[PDB]
Amino acid sequence: PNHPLWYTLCDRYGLYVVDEANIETHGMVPMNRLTDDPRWLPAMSERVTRMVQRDRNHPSVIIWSLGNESGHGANHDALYRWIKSVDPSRPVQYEGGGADTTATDIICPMYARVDEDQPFPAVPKWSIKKWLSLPGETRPLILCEYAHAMGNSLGGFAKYWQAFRQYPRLQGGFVWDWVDQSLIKYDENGNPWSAYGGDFGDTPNDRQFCM
C-alpha cells in the first residue's frame, strides 16, 4: 500500500490503480513455505484486511492484489475469499504459483512472452495468446509485469501492443517498471553520482538489478 496521498491524486488526475498487500516472501524455499503455513495466516491477513479497510472508498483502486512473489499457499485462498466477501466491487488478482491459480480472477503473469512458451516445471509462462485458450480457461489476461525496462531495453514492445489490440481477452499489462532505484552519492569533489547495489558497502547485493 502506498502513501495515502497517492490514491487521492490518482482519483483526481485519473489513473487506474492496483492496490497491493505488503506481502512478498520471494526468498523462501520453496516460495510458498510461509504462505502455505497456517501459523503465518494471522500476519498475512492483517496486511490484506487493513489495506482494504483503509483504501476501499477510493475510485482509482479498481483491483485488489494479494501481494507479490510468495508462491501460492492456502493463506492466499483464504484471503482471496475474504476480499471477495467484504468487497464484491473489485476483482482480486495474484500472480504467485503460476499466475492462473484459484487465488486470482485475472491471469496475471510476469514476463510471459507474446508468441514464445517458457514451459518451466510447475509454473510455466505460456505465450499469452496460448494461455487464454488453454482447455477450460475463461479469464482475462493482464500481465502484472512485462517488458523489463532495464537499461537499453523495451525491444519487442510493439509485439505486445499488437497482440493486446488483436485479442479481446488480452487486456494489457504493467511495465516493469517506472523509475530506476538509483541513489545519489558524492565524490571527493562533492559532485553527485548515481549509485546502485554494492555502492554502500552492502553485501551480498544484486548490483544494477534495481535500475
Residue 167 engages its own copies in binding (rule: CB under 8 A): yes
Q: Residues 151-170 vs Na ion: string with x where CB under 5 A?
A: -------------x-----x
Assess 158 for contact with its own copies (CB under 8 A).
no
168 lines the binding site for its own copies (CB under 8 A)? yes
Site string for its own copies, 109-138 (x = CB under 8 A): --------x---------x-xx-xxxxxxx
Catalytic residues: 69, 145
Q: Which does 209 bind (CB under 5 to 8 A by kind): Na ion, its own copies, none?
A: Na ion
Tell me which of Na ion, its own copies, none is bound by residue 111, counting a contact when its beta carbon lies within the kind-specific cut-off of 5 to 8 angstroms.
none
Residue 106 Cα distances to 26, 103, 140, 144, 204, angstroms = 21, 9, 6, 10, 36
Write down the least CB distance from residue 117 to its own copies, Å: 7
Binding residues for substrate: 69, 145-148
Minimum distance, C-beta of residue 88 to its own copies, in the bound complex (Å): 21
Least distance (Å) from Na ion to the CB of residue 21?
19
Does the protein bind Na ion through residue 141 (CB under 5 A)?
no
Contact, 119 vs 85, CB < 8 A?
no
Q: Does residue 133 interact with Na ion by CB under 5 A?
A: no
